[PDB]
Amino acid sequence: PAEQVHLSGPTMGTTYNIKYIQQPGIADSKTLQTEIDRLLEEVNDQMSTYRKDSELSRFNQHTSSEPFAVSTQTLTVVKEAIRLNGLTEGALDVTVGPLVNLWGFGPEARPDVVPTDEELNARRAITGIEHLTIEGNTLSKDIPELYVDLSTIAKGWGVDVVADYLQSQGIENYMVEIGGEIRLKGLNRDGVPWRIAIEKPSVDQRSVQEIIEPGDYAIATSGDYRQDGVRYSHIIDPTTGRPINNRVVSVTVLDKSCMTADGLATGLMVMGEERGMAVAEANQIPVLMIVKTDDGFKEYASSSFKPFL
Numbered sequence: 001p002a003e004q005v006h007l008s009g010p011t012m013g014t015t016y017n018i019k020y021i022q023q024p025g026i027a028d029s030k031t032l033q034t035e036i037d038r039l040l041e042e043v044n045d046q047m048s049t050y051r052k053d054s055e056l057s058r059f060n061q062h063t064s065s066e067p068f069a070v071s072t073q074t075l076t077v078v079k080e081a082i083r084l085n086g087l088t089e090g091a092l093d094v095t096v097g098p099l100v101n102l103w104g105f106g107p108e109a110r111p112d113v114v115p116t117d118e119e120l121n122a123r124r125a126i127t128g129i130e131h132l133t134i135e136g137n138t139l140s141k142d143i144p145e146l147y148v149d150l151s152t153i154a155k156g157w158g159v160d161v162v163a164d165y166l167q168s169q170g171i172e173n174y175m176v177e178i179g180g181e182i183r184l185k186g187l188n189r190d191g192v193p194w195r196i197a198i199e200k201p202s203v204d205q206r207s208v209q210e211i212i213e214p215g216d217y218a219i220a221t222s223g224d225y226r227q228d229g230v231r232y233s234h235i236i237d238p239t240t241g242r243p244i245n246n247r248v249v250s251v252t253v254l255d256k257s258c259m260t261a262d263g264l265a266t267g268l269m270v271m272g273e274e275r276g277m278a279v280a281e282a283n284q285i286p287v288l289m290i291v292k293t294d295d296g297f298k299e300y301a302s303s304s305f306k307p308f309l
C-alpha cells in the first residue's frame with residue numbers, strides 16, 4: 001500500500017504543496033523539506049520584487065546603462081521572459097512593473113483613486129521590453145526607471161527547481177504546486193497519473209470541475225473563473241497600460257517546463273482567444289481558454305490539448 005507524503009509551507013506570498021510517493025532509499029521528509037525551503041528562499045532572494053535586496057530589486061534600483069551581473073537562474077528566467085515576449089507578439093512583457101505597481105498589484109502602496117491619464121502615461125513611458133537587453137551573464141536597461149516584474153514566470157521557475165530537486169533525490173512520483181502552478185511526474189498513491197481539476201464557469205453559477213491527467217507535464221493557469229463595470233485585475237495589457245479588458249476568463253497551458261507554462265498562460269490571456277489560440281496552434285502548445293460569450297461561456301482547446309479532455 002503506497003505511502004504519500006504531503007509537504008506544505010510559505011513562499012512568494014502564497015503556499016506550496018508537494019506530494020510524493022515514498023520509495024526505498026530516499027531521504028526522510030525533513031531532509032527534503034529543508035532543501036526545498038532553501039531552494040525556494042533562493043528563488044525569492046533572486047527574483048522577488050517585494051524583497052528590497054533581491055537581485056531583481058537591486059537591478060530595478062540600478063540607474064546606469066552599464067551591465068548588471070545576475071545569477072544563472074535569474075538569467076535563465078529573464079531569457080525565457082524575452083523569448084515568450086516575442087512568441088506572444090509583445091503581450092507578455094515583464095517590464096510592465098511600473099504599471100502593475102500603479103494599479104495596486106505590486107509592492108507600491110496605492111490609494112482607491114483611479115490613476116489620472118497623466119500618471120498612467122508617465123508609467124507607460126518607462127515600460128517596454130525593447131529597453132531590456134541580455135549580454136552574457138548581465139542585464140542592461142537603456143532607461144533608469146525600468147522596473148522588471150517576474151511575478152508571471154518565476155513561480156513556474158520555483159516549481160521546476162523543486163521538481164528537479166525531487167528527481168535528484170530519486171523521487172519519480174510527485175506533484176509540485178506553488179500558488180496553483182503545477183508540475184507532475186509518475187503516479188499518485190492509487191497508482192494512477194496525478195489528477196488536476198480545470199474550473200469551468202457555468203451560466204447557473206454552480207462550481208464545475210473537469211478532472212484531467214496531464215501525465216509527466218507542468219500545468220499553469222491565469223485568470224480566475226470566480227456586475228458589468230471597468231475590468232480590474234492584476235494582468236496588464238502592455239499596449240493600453242491598463243488591466244486587460246477582453247473576453248478571456250482563464251487560460252490553462254501544458255508544457256514540460258512550469259516556467260514556460262506560467263509565462264504562456266498569462267501571455268496568451270493578454271493576446272485574447274483569436275490571436276492566442278492562433279499562437280497555440282502554430283507552436284504545438286496545449287491550451288484551454290475559457291471565454292465569456294454574449295449569454296454564457298465557451299471553451300477553445302488547441303489541437304495539442306484535445307487529447308487531455
Ligand SMILES: Cc1cc2nc3c(=O)[nH]c(=O)nc-3n(C[C@H](O)[C@H](O)[C@H](O)COP(=O)(O)OP(=O)(O)OC[C@H]3O[C@@H](n4cnc5c(N)ncnc54)[C@H](O)[C@@H]3O)c2cc1C
Nearest residue numbers: 012013047048050092093094151152154155222234235236
Ligand atoms: C519570486 C516571487 C516572489 C513573490 N513575493 C511576493 C511577496 O513577497 N508578497 C506578495 O504579496 N506577493 C508576492 N509574489 C506574488 C506576485 O506579486 C503575484 O501576485 C503572483 O506572482 C501572481 O501570480 P499568478 O500566477 O496569479 O499570476 P500570472 O497570471 O501568472 O501573472 C500575473 C502577474 O504578472 C505581472 N504581470 C501583469 N501583467 C503582465 C504582463 N502583461 N506581462 C508580464 N507580467 C505581467 C503582475 O505581477 C501580475 O500579478 C511573488 C511572486 C514571485 C514570482
Ligand SMILES: [Mg+2]
Nearest residue numbers: 152262263266
Ligand atoms: Mg504567468
Ligand SMILES: [Mg+2]
Nearest residue numbers: 152155181262
Ligand atoms: Mg502564474
